[PDB]
Write a protein that binds this ligand. Structure first.
Ligand SMILES: N#CC1(CS(=O)(=O)N2Cc3ccc(Cl)cc3[C@@]3(CCN(c4cncc5ccccc45)C3=O)C2)CC1
Ligand SMILES: [Cl-]
Lengths: 287, 305
């Protein structure tokens, strides 16, 4: 029992965090094999100072790929895990290892919002902190922190330097678009509440995907697609509540509220747990 | 900017997780130097749990009855002893990944990170607090026994909790690393219930100061309160009494934001009275109590917005 916002164990990523200094700028880098990846806004080889723990690494080459700077170093990281660079879609979740001066200070779980921002917890010096998922023993790097927007939200790139969202890496008038709730994730979290014995919000009603999408559009909820319904199949079979039956519960929570009640200790409808996160936490998958 | 429930990086603890098997029972152990620490109920069967005599069960065991697995490597047990509700298995190999560490016993209201494990393999990390009723609202399934709670201030890992059991309400109970339970609990399957839980007042206050640091002041009012009047009201909402120690501990945050602790207490009094009215504080519609004054100073900036 219990439902927590759980992050992946960060150990395989901690062994890759280094400090990168170029002139007056100091931020974080990801050391994989003989390359250090970091935001290009950190800007010859000796101008780049790279520190891995107490050891100074020697930069022997440099190149740029989109908004990421790649510093070829002389030493391959002996702690390099099995890894892949993956680009995630909005709604997908990941763990963030927040670092300052190449030293990890915290780990949290979050989701890529539909407006491509992340509601993170970052201070000055956190640039170059990374987002990741673990699938068996392979680390899938999906995010590198670049900046904070005027509303306190964060923007960054995949590990190939491509920004998530209509953002650029520079000081200019940039604003996060109007955000929406990740519907498939709220539904998954309602199924996790049913698994943990919270059924007060269940009703005898069902709905059509068309009728529900008209309700979702009215409450700034992302449209629910047939793919989302198919993805919720296992949770529907485990609890005995059809996806459109759970959609009728969500419609009633949106039109009437919680009425002093909570779901999994929350008075808001939680949208940062994917259908896969719910299955993984309610099964004990290890890494 | 931003405020998240953040856990400590778990890498130093991952390198200590092992699997301990005694007969049919399989749970997690903490491998530090040449000792593996795990719940003593690993020597029990399900039947044994009603009234276990651990001394009688342990005396019938030998070293080779305890199987310890560290990754793909089998560790050899060369000795065993019991300290309160923890079993200590002396092994023939010191853990090369042993970090700098201490065993600390925490008080209610204190927070810590939990590395949840199954079969000696870590699966997730989360942040939580020791509730005033000594339970933890964790996320544990069968096989998670022996998972540990910790804080990592500087490079030293302070181990404060080892998971032992789930109570009938879905909450969890465990011990410090010396085997002493937190709360009036026993490692027996007896009628045990968590006491009535309360909100950690000093933590809610710290979180209100964190909201002021991040630029939110809608909840503040022009009133102050006496400490006693605050407690008379807060006790009616099932809030823990606020002591002079709590007020002293909130001193730095009070000086940083310019809001006296008893003025922040008046805002809390009013928040309990009125509710939120469709508003949120740091993206939350409830009053959050799992961030200590120390956590707020660590996560939030030194400059108030
Ligand atoms: N109410 C209740 C429960 C507990 S029990 O009655 O099955 N149980 C008695 C018991 C008594 C004392 C001790 Cl020290 C340990 C144990 C056990 C050992 C494993 N465990 C667990 C531990 N953690 C999470 C868990 C989740 C789900 C099933 C077990 C879990 C226990 O609680 C077993 C069903 C959840
Ligand atoms: Cl403490």
């Amino acid at each position: 029992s219990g439902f927590r916002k759980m992050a992946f164990p960060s150990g395989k990523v901690e062994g890759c965090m280094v400090q990168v200094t170029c002139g007056t700028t100091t931020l974080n880098g990801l050391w994989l094999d003989d390359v250090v990846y970091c935001p290009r806004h950190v800007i010859s080889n000796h101008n780049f100072l790279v520190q891995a723990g107490n050891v100074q690494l020697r930069v022997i080459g440099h190149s740029m790929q989109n908004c990421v700077l790649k510093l070829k170093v002389d030493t391959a990281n002996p702690k390099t895990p099995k890894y892949k660079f993956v680009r995630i879609q909005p709604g997908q979740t990941f763990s963030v290892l927040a670092c300052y001066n190449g030293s990890p200070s915290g780990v949290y779980q979050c989701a890529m919002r539909p407006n491509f921002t992340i509601k993170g917890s970052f201070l000055n010096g956190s640039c170059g902190s990374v987002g990741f998922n673990i699938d068996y023993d392979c680390v899938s790097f999906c995010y590198m922190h670049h900046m904070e927007l005027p509303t306190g939200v964060h923007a960054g790139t995949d590990l190939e330097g491509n920004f998530y969202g209509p953002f650029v890496d520079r000081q200019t008038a940039q604003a996060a678009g109007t955000d929406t709730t990740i519907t498939v994730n709220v539904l998954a979290w309602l199924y996790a509440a049913v698994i943990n014995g919270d059924r007060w919000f269940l009703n005898r009603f069902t709905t059509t995907l068309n009728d529900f999408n008209l309700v979702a559009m009215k409450y700034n909820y992302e449209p629910l697609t047939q793919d989302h319904v198919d993805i919720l199949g296992p949770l529907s079979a485990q609890t005995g509540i059809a996806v459109l039956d759970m959609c009728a519960s969500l419609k009633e929570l949106l039109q009437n509220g919680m009425n002093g009640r909570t779901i999994l200790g929350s008075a808001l409808l939680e949208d940062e747990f994917t259908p896969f996160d719910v299955v993984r936490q309610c099964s004990g998958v290890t890494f």
